[PDB]
Design a protein around this ligand. Structure first.
Ligand SMILES: *[C@@H]1O[C@H](CO)[C@@H](O)[C@H](O)[C@H]1NC(C)=O
Ligand SMILES: *[C@@H]1O[C@H](CO)[C@@H](O)[C@H](O)[C@H]1NC(C)=O
Ligand SMILES: *[C@@H]1O[C@H](CO)[C@@H](O)[C@H](O)[C@H]1NC(C)=O
Ligand SMILES: *[C@@H]1O[C@H](CO)[C@@H](O)[C@H](O)[C@H]1NC(C)=O
Ligand SMILES: *[C@@H]1O[C@H](CO)[C@@H](O)[C@H](O)[C@H]1NC(C)=O
Ligand SMILES: *[C@@H]1O[C@H](CO)[C@@H](O)[C@H](O)[C@H]1NC(C)=O
Ligand SMILES: *[C@@H]1O[C@H](CO)[C@@H](O)[C@H](O)[C@H]1NC(C)=O
Ligand SMILES: *[C@@H]1O[C@H](CO)[C@@H](O)[C@H](O)[C@H]1NC(C)=O
Ligand SMILES: *[C@@H]1O[C@H](CO)[C@@H](O)[C@H](O)[C@H]1NC(C)=O
Ligand SMILES: [Zn+2]
Length: 889
């Protein structure tokens, strides 16, 4: 359905003729439904804007708002044109006011409107969340504006670069607390018409993007602390959660992290307070609204009793991430969404800095490697991938904007920034960044503003030298999709680079670390050249070399056979000579190379042989997610049996190691890494049928059922023990776990049960479960997508979920963009390896082509591309893979 752009109201980007100065917004949520089912809110809003250039039309964003139509006033006296007519243009989400005369440049105007909207179970705009306290049902009102939902709350020019000051008022019941970005201005006052309602006015915001606005009406309480910089910190949640002390851990790390960031970047946090609030219904993990940060309960709340170590790492990490946005993205904002990584890439990298400071003994910084680097490479190796910075004119529609919210902007951004930091030295990097923040505070930026400030810092200094300007290096990482594979011929010292695939010509300037028989060598820079030679990369005799120590650069390395064998021999002899992270890398890169058909698949499998004597977290993690792909390809085939037998063989000694160290699973390992390694160990043993593990799970889960009130199972072990107990059992185990889920007060516990229920081997149980997935009384809309994905991951659940998604698609499309919908498509299609399944996917697309795929559109394309690649890969490799596992088991 095309629009003719001759009309500016048919265009997706706002005109540049009018700029907002400030807003007054008054909102009134009605927390009881009217006389059918409907919860609504009422609003009144006034925008003050300046006319930059003459125009006879006023165009602002408005979505799903009903008007009760508008009033235009000149500031003081500028005479003002009369209003001719006023219309809503739905597709493009505009309220359009046609004038009988033109506004004049330099003049200011105020436009006033009253409206009404649904407080939907939407999770977008102004919406309702619900929960239980005792036997009473509670409703609260909350916001999610990013990326373009502000317009769903009140009329505004809803684009990130048009920054304004906001004066917010909330009209709410006497006994409910009203929160916003700023603290309250003075006291609440009774509503004139109805003294049971109160009017709460908030202090003016600093100059700010609309997508950062937040307002909340609830019965929540807080615990509070002042941070070292004088900023007031509060943690808000459900009264029972606060009282049970679930907000304490968040209170411990928040101020310290906020203060760390202010010092590290030499930029003070400008607001008087920063509120953190845990919401029962929320779409993403967390949202960075300036002064009031919103989280899912599982990203904020922590119970040291029933919460996992993973849950705990998730809390500091999400908090750090959200605080980082106070600087990157709030104080300084991207000019437009094609640049999303200037916000998200930065927060994704600095989250690790912040989290490391709050938890210095964890060694978090390493998690960025499996957690960001190798996660995104799988996707960034597609021809359908996109560069960090896409061209502005290619991002227009709301769905295209939501699509920018993918792993490229987050994880590749973080990766590439970690590389930049590493070759600059964070000390130098942070100076450049402080200069960029101070220069651009309360304004917007493009990637070019970033480089120029980094360049300035480099220029002012001597010790660090670059082969080129920061821009020449970074433009190649920023403006072209993908990453190079770097190939080393170890006999001659030839080194080359090639775009890794399943205007700069796909050449990068690549910083290269190396290690020779375990000792550091001089750093090296590969310029943008397809090949070069250096004696750093030449080995003699039995020596070996490894490139990209600690996987600091974003790229993968392939060697000649003989070096590979040397590495392998080293892993058998003393694996400690190789840095633990690079041990993981030899695995990730092996498998990725085998996947892309650039090395025989037996190389990857052979690199798996030493895991025999590996107790460290990361190399196992590398194997697990690498083989995860084989699992997706082969778990329906004859490869599967031998493959499981092999993993049992490899995993067993690690499992025994932990049994002993852990004293019959009574004591938990000391450090985080080792705890992670124990969790992977048990998980792998059970998934693969280690009898000792399956016995453990059955015994423990059985003990739990006979005494529901005391759960015998340590939280770290729960995901694995629940899953396997349910897998081995039947309706009794399932109904028990379901009863636990329905009454569960801790979200972490609920999440573990939700995934475990998806492990049943009975088709009828899984299909019934899918049914529950669409009932909001049973599964909250925010959990529906991940629940369906859990079921799809079950090999027996695969066809159930695929059929369910196809037949429920219309329904699923209206409700459940922002990242879940795309995850649904990706999750159900991961296994398609055959032409028949490919045709199936094509048919699905064709059948639904009318009502589109929305924010999942690009996900569907990548699903198709990958499927095609799987078919070719699976036919080529299955004989070899099968034979290999047979021999080695
Ligand atoms: C909001 O409040 C500030 C401070 O009182 C004021 O200067 C600004 O003009 C107000 N915005 C309006 C009235 O749109
Ligand atoms: C916005 O709010 C402030 C506080 O009530 C007020 O001073 C100002 O007049 C309002 N702006 C209008 C009515 O345009
Ligand atoms: C918006 O108006 C439409 C049609 O007039 C109506 O269906 C809906 O109830 C309204 N939403 C409100 C009043 O919140
Ligand atoms: C607020 O008042 C309402 C209506 O009586 C009540 O349902 C709710 O429990 C109250 N919340 C409080 C007192 O925190
Ligand atoms: C919160 O901080 C206090 C002081 O360090 C501590 O007693 C408590 O263990 C912390 N809660 C955690 C780490 O979950
Ligand atoms: C710190 O920021 C101040 C300006 O607020 C500036 O004077 C100084 O150069 C900055 N120093 C560093 C090391 O970033
Ligand atoms: C975006 O930022 C630039 C400075 O980088 C500023 O001059 C411009 O006014 C900003 N755009 C808007 C709409 O404010
Ligand atoms: C690589 O990482 C380890 C920790 O995993 C660290 O101790 C070592 O110093 C790092 N090596 C380099 C060259 O940064
Ligand atoms: C393994 O190599 C490391 C040095 O990387 C050394 O500390 C250790 O002693 C070696 N182990 C043996 C058995 O030689
Ligand atoms: Zn973010």
């Amino acid at each position: 359905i095309t629009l003719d752009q001759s009309k500016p109201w048919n265009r997706y980007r706002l005109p540049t003729t009018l700029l907002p100065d400030s807003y007054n917004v008054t909102l009134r949520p009605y927390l009881t439904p009217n006389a059918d089912g409907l919860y609504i809110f009422k609003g009144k809003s006034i925008v003050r804007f300046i006319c930059q250039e003459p125009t006879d039309v006023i165009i602002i964003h408005s979505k799903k708002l009903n008007y009760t139509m508008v009033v235009l006033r000149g500031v003081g006296d500028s005479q003002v044109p009369e209003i001719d007519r006023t219309e809503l243009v739905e597709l493009t989400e505009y309220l359009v006011v046609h004038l009988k005369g033109s506004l004049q440049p330099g003049h200011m105007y105020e436009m006033e409107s009253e409206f009404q909207g649904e407080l939907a179970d939407d999770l977008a705009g102004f919406y309702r969340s619900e929960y239980m306290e005792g036997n009473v049902k509670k409703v609260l009102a909350t916001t999610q504006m990013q990326s373009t939902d502000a317009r769903k709350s009140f009329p505004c020019f809803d684009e990130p670069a048009m920054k304004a000051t906001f004066n917010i008022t909330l009209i709410h019941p006497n006994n409910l607390t009203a929160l916003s970005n700023m603290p309250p201005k003075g006291s609440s006052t009774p509503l004139a018409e109805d003294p049971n309602w109160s009017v709460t006015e908030f202090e003016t915001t600093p100059v700010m993007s609309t997508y950062l606005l937040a307002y909340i009406v609830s019965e929540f309480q807080s615990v509070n602390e002042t941070a070292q910089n004088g900023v007031l910190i509060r943690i808000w949640a459900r009264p029972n959660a606060i009282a049970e002390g679930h907000g304490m851990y968040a209170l411990n790390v928040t101020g310290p992290i906020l203060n760390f960031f202010a010092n590290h970047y030499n930029t003070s946090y400008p607001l008087p307070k920063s509120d953190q609030i845990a919401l029962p219904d929320f779409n993403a993990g967390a949202m960075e609204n300036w002064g009031l940060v919103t989280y899912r309960e599982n990203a904020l709340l922590f119970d040291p009793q029933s919460s996992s170590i993973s849950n705990k790492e998730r809390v500091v990490t999400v908090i750090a991430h959200e605080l980082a946005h106070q600087w990157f993205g709030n104080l300084v904002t991207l000019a437009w969404w094609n640049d999303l990584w200037l916000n998200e890439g930065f927060a994704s990298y600095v989250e690790y800095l912040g989290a490391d400071h709050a938890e210095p003994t964890w060694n978090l910084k390493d998690l960025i490697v499996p957690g960001d680097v190798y996660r995104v490479m799988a996707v960034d190796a597609l021809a359908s991938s996109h560069p960090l910075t896409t061209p502005a004119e290619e991002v227009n529609t709301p769905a295209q904007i939501s699509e920018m919210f993918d792993s490229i902007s987050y994880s590749k951004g973080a990766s590439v920034i970690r590389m930049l930091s590493n070759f600059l030295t964070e000390d130098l990097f942070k100076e450049g960044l402080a200069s960029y923040l101070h220069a651009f505070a309360y304004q917007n930026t493009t990637y070019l503003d970033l480089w120029e400030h980094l360049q300035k810092a480099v220029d002012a200094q001597t010790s660090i030298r670059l082969p080129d300007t920061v821009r020449a290096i970074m433009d190649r990482w920023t403006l072209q999709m993908g990453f190079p594979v770097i190939t080393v011929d170890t006999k001659t010292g030839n080194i080359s680079q090639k775009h890794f695939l399943l205007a700069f010509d796909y050449l990068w300037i690549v910083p290269i670390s190396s290690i020779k028989n375990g000792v550091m060598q001089d750093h090296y820079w590969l310029r943008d050249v397809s090949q070069a030679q250096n004696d750093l990369f030449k080995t003699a005799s039995d020596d070996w070399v490894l490139l990209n120590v600690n996987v600091t650069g974003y790229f993968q390395v392939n060697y000649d056979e003989d070096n590979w064998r040397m590495i392998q021999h080293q892993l058998q002899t003393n694996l400690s000579v190789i840095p633990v992270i690079n041990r993981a890398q030899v695995i990730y890169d092996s498998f990725n190379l085998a996947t892309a058909h650039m090395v025989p698949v037996t190389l990857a499998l052979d690199n798996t042989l030493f895991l025999n004597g590996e107790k460290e977290y990361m190399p196992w993690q590398a194997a697990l997610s690498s083989l995860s792909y084989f699992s997706l390809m082969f778990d329906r085939s004859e490869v599967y049996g031998p493959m499981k037998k092999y993993l049992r063989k490899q995993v067993e000694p690690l499992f025994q190691h932990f049994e002993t160290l852990t004293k019959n699973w009574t004591e938990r390992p000391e450090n985080l890494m080792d705890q992670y390694s124990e969790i992977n160990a048990i998980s792998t043993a059970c998934s693969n049928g280690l009898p000792q593990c399956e016995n453990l799970a059955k015994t423990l889960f059985d003990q739990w059922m006979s005494d529901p009130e005391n759960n015998p199972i340590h939280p770290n072990l729960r995901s694995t023990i629940y899953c396997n107990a349910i897998a081995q059992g039947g309706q009794d185990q399932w109904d028990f776990a379901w009863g636990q889920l329905q009454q569960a007060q801790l979200v972490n516990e609920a999440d573990k049960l939700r995934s475990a229920l998806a492990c049943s081997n009975e088709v009828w149980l899984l299909n019934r479960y899918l049914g529950y997935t669409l009932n909001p009384d049973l599964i909250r809309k925010q959990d529906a997508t991940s629940t369906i994905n859990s079921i799809a991951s079950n090999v027996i659940g695969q066809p159930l979920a695929w059929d369910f998604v196809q037949s429920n698609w219309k329904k699923l499309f209206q409700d459940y963009g922002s990242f879940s919908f795309s995850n649904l498509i990706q999750g159900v299609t991961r296994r398609f390896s055959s032409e028949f399944e490919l045709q199936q996917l094509e048919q699905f697309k064709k059948n639904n082509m009318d009502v589109g795929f929305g924010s999942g559109t690009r996900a569907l394309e990548q699903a198709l591309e990958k499927t095609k690649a799987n078919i070719k890969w699976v036919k080529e490799n299955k004989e070899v893979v099968l034979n290999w596992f047979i021999e080695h088991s």
